[PDB]
């Protein structure tokens, strides 16, 4: 027949996620020394909508 | 073309198939035999013939 929608969404020309209005990844800070031997202080400076 | 629905006789299992009306389909050579019955041993039925 012909390729079908999921079978083209894998290849992903027009189905790639949109990225212009995102703040990057949301992640936990790296487990370097402090989070596995003690703690560290941080300041929530702001809160923001992610698109 | 003919749809056929038939009962497996030694098992009791339905079997539906279909194939054109003019193509060849195999048939076995079924036979009934009317056997008399005597004293039943372990699970094997016990039937005799006239000769």
């Amino acid at each position: 027949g012909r390729v079908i929608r999921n079978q083209r969404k894998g290849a992903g020309s027009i189905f790639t996620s949109h990225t212009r209005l995102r703040q990057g990844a949301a992640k936990l800070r790296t487990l370097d020394y402090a989070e596995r031997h003690g703690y560290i202080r941080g300041i929530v400076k702001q809160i923001v909508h992610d698109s | 073309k003919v749809h056929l629905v038939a009962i497996d006789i030694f098992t009791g299992k339905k079997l539906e198939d279909l194939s054109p009306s003019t193509h060849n389909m195999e048939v076995p050579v079924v036979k009934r035999n009317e056997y008399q019955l005597l004293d039943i041993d372990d699970g094997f039925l016990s039937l005799m013939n006239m000769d």
């Binding site: 027949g1 012909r2 390729v3 079908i4 999921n6 079978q7 | -």
Partner: protein, 50 residues
């Protein structure tokens, strides 16, 4: 609602799937349109039971 070229449900003078939509996990890429690796179907009546 598609054509039979465009999907494994498509075509027919009536909008009907025709061949059952419950698809094996060991199917292939091209056949896995529909309900995939399903254990039961229909309306559940009761509890998720977990």
């Amino acid at each position: 609602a598609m054509n039979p070229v465009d999907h494994p449900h498509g075509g027919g003078n009536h909008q009907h799937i025709g061949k059952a939509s419950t698809i094996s996990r060991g199917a292939v890429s091209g056949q896995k349109a529909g309900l995939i690796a399903a254990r039961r179907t229909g309306l559940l009546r009761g509890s998720q039971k977990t």
